[PDB]
Design a protein around this nucleic acid. Sequence first.
DNA 1: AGAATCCCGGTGCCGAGGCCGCTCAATTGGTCGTAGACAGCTCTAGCACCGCTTAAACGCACGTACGCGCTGTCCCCCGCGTTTTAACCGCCAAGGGGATTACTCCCTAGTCTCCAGGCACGTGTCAGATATATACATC
DNA 2: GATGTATATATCTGACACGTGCCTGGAGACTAGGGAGTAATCCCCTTGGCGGTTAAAACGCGGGGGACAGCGCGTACGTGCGTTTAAGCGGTGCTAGAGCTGTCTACGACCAATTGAGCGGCCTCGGCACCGGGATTCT
Lengths: 253, 104, 104, 97, 78, 87, 90, 90, 96, 94
Amino acid sequence: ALRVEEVQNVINAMQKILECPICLELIKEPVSTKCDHIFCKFCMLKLLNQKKGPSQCPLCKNDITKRSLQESTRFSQLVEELLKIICAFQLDTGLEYANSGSGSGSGALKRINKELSDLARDPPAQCSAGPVGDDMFHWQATIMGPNDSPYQGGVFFLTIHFPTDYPFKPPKVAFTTRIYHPNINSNGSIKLDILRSQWSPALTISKVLLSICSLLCDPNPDDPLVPEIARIYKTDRDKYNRISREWTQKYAM
Amino acid sequence: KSRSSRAGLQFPVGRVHRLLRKGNYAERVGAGAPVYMAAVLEYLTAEILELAGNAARDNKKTRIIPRHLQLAIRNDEELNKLLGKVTIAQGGVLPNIQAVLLPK
Amino acid sequence: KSRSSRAGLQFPVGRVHRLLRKGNYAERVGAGAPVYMAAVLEYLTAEILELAGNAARDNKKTRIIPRHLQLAIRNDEELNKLLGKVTIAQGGVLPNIQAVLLPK
Amino acid sequence: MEPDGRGAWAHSRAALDRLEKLLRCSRCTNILREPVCLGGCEHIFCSNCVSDCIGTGCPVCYTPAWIQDLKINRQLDSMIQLCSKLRNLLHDNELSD
Amino acid sequence: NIQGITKPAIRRLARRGGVKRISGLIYEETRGVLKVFLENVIRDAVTYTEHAKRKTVTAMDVVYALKRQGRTLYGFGG
Amino acid sequence: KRHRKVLRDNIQGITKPAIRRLARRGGVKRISGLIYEETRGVLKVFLENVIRDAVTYTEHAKRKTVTAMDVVYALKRQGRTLYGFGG
Amino acid sequence: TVALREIRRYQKSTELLIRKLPFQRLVREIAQDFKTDLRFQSSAVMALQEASEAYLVGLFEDTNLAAIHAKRVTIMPKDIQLARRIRGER
Amino acid sequence: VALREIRRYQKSTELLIRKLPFQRLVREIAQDFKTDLRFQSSAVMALQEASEAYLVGLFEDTNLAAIHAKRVTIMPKDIQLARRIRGERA
Amino acid sequence: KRSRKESYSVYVYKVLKQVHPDTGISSKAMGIMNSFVNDIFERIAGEASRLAHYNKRSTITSREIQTAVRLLLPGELAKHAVSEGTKAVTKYTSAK
Amino acid sequence: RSRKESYSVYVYKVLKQVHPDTGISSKAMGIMNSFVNDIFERIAGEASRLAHYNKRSTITSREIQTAVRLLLPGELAKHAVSEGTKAVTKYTSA
DNA sequence: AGAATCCCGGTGCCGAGGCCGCTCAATTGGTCGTAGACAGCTCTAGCACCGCTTAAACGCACGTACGCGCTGTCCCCCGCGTTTTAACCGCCAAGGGGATTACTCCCTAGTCTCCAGGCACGTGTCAGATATATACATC
DNA sequence: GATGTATATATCTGACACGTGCCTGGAGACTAGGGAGTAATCCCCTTGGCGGTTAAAACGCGGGGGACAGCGCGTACGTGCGTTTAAGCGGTGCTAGAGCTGTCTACGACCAATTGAGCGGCCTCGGCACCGGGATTCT
Ligand SMILES: [Zn+2]
Ligand SMILES: [Zn+2]
Ligand SMILES: [Zn+2]
Ligand SMILES: [Zn+2]
């Protein structure tokens, strides 16, 4: 262990920098944009090619277009040499250059396995999360209600099923218990703003888990899963918050 | 070899030269003038064709029709600013219904 | 005599001719071209000045000011179409208050 | 260190110099702390190099860009710090055993 | 003679424009607007034809007439 | 080089009275308080378009000063013609 | 409900919405006031018809905005006059 | 009171925006293209004149839109409509 | 050290006096009329140039100018402008 | 013959190097011919005007750069100019 | 009776109105070239016509989603007075860029010669348009 | 439950992708000349900062007109149905003028030589700006 962790961390950090919203590995096909961060040609084009109107940049508040993009050039050159360094790395330290990024090369499994591995090292900003145990695509989480909510102090349990094209397409987010909320189905299904026309790779497990509690803070009765609740929130608003609070005290989990 | 070959262009640099001269845009036309211009005309052509192509794919067609050229222009804000005064034959309109007209 | 004298025009037929060639509008300019053009420039000039002069008289002024040139235009349908896209420096606007804004 | 390792160690060192080679002019002689990039042609500038591309533009190249096309890439800032950190870490391990 | 533009014809144009409801009084006004538009374009198109000493108004004369009004057509060879 | 550039929210130089007077010239009887913010936004964009071109013309001439002629040409390029400053 | 079905159906299409023959008649009746004994290329008539419909459609798009601006759905003579004036003076 | 104000401002030929703060705005924008850029004093005047003319024309159209909606007070929504029809931002 | 711009200010004065012998025009107002003349000049020369190309001609004659006017000026304004044009040319050509 | 030439042959070549799987209908081609001539005229038009405004008689690539930046909105010009300068550079070196 | 729009008479500011003296650009006359006007012919594309076909347009009656006007309550806009800011005038100097000349020599126009890249045309495949039967997604 | 929208296939009717041979604009290579590229002068006019005067913008408060949200009434469209209507299609036959070719001549680029209509700057008043007081709107 001749300071191999330090060499490993600096080299792995290099990859961390040159890593897109979808890929959890060194970018092999980098393209530059107007704002200061590199994306993959394949990954960005797929995002831009969705019928969602003008797309916002997944790594900042600015926007993105197909135009204005250029061969990263310098960064493409960095990638090639960095790969050559990794060859040497396996002989210099003999350590891995990834946090168990050994899943399927299609990315369907490697991406979800790698994010969970990173999760263990760096959990969601305001909550706990980990695997259910049925598959690597089925995760659990425990989230407490923020102060700005009728659900304040309540804690809910999630069971989220991820697709093979995650995070390009939204996951099946669900609660195990029915919550008195416009966007929560009696079967647990959750409809977040971010899970439809606003879904993108921008959203990570931390952001998604935070978004769920954010929706509890501020519900969206437009095209609800449960109209019987959504109508009350839309029309009275305050009536909903009072009922939701009472419900939470017994059914939060 | 042609000028277009040397310039790495598909557009007829030789023709552009002739057009600029005959068109009396100026008393004289520089050697690099038609080269630069051809590159621009070709670039813009490529931009509109690429988008028209994608439109063809959306409709499961393998041939470009006037409608596809217009859908390409209308969806891209940049082209809309350039060609906002142009009507495309049989272009129809870009589909759009305002929220106030829809079911609630 | 002069060319404008023979034509009976106030505008410089000779300078109009020079501009048509200098501006490179065509390879050649016909002998009758600058005369016709000069006459039109004169006609339009006369129409604006005549109306501007009338505006000055209404305001009890002797010298024409930019506002009078503009009012003459704004009060003339033929000139509004001709110079509709033109802004006259320090012209102000044609006075106008809608009935719906007035007391009842 | 072993025959395969020592070769690799020398490689990684040489690789760092090659990575830095990416930022060059008659004055951009080393990796820059605050490199400025120009959209449309790259040509990364020294700390007092961007001032010339603002005044006139790139030598020979002369890209007709606006002053809004000039900015420091945050990604380089981070990568550059790491390449310096790695240079020293590799050298110390090579020296120690 | 302008009645050649039928009520349904106007409705169809309005539908393409995204109109949900049409007042029955618009049809008379719409025809008026159309009449004016055509008069302006034709006047110019005829002028071009007369200039060329032709008795036929060609597609190119319509196109030029329209370019001058800020409405360029594509696909007619102009 | 050596320019003491000043970066400020100078759009605020166009105040309520200024906008109010312009609106009055346009025949507006009452102005919502939200107009002031909207108007400034519109003005800034308009000026950006005209200035961008005026500068572009200046750059072409290899000059460092924007002349009255360049503003006038810029406006014509934008489809608006101004009399009294050009020739 | 029908209007929405028709709006979608027409926006998806490209054909000219004015019957060709009666349109041509309108053109000829106007043309005679500029010069007699004029003939038209068949393509010229199409070019003119296309320009005409495009004009009216664009006008209706703007008119529709004016109507919803006034918090109504139905297009009134008043709405077309407003849209026409703002556009007409540009 | 406002009606008298309208008459006076329509009648006068004076610039309605104070000259100094306007010039500052022009420079504030212009510096974003090139640094150390100079202007002829007449160039700024020309720009200001065009600028005021532009806004007045826009306000005249805005006013009409508000009237159409059976309102007297103009809203941001009315400016946006006028621009949308003119096609400034469409 | 010579002006390369010139103006029509001397001709505007002459025309002005013929219409309003007892009036004058300010220098700012003169700037407006000077620009006006060059604006119209460009429009007419512009259309005439286009007609030359559109009709496969290399020469601009009084015919093109006449047509350009009919296109550029509205309604009856054109009617008079054409009349003044043809009159000036006829007199000039016949030299009477 | 006297019939006006078009760019249909070049439009094909451009499409094949961009989106090779598809073809072009004859009417679509007609639209593209107008597009090329429209843009051609606009650029050439501005290049001419600039030559007059700057008291010059020869149009060079420099005047065109200016004309293009004036006509093409947004970021479109940035890409268009880039292609322009590259073509000139290669042409010059050849 | 109060407060804002003009007029009347008076001085003084500085703008423009006429004239001096000079010289670029207007005008004249002559030579030669060719772009346009005209005559003369082919046969393309347009005009007017007929009759049958069937999707489009005319006219009617039902009833209801929308337009219109009225009432009542909220707030946020306009007018007023007072304080504070910095817009504007007039002055001073330095010094950076504009417009100007005067020489250089490199780039484009015009000249001929000779060639293969695009034009018109025709052949043969096949891509899209219509219509049928298949099951779901809306309304 | 009852209509209407995308799905996958058979059929086949023009329009597109390709290939053949012709020749008309492209490229090659050379001279002459004039356009704009560089260097160097020096004269505006742009920038910046100084103070003082005082007009315009900014703050806070009164309270009232306009925005707009809800209610109820009336009818002007929208929906479907059934009855004609002439718009669209194909085919026929006539002929007016669009475009091609060839001949010849008013007339337009170009040059060199004479000279005067407008340029640019200076001397002389006279039309407007604005003070200070009055009467007429006009609320
Ligand atoms: Zn990626
Ligand atoms: Zn970003
Ligand atoms: Zn450098
Ligand atoms: Zn560069």
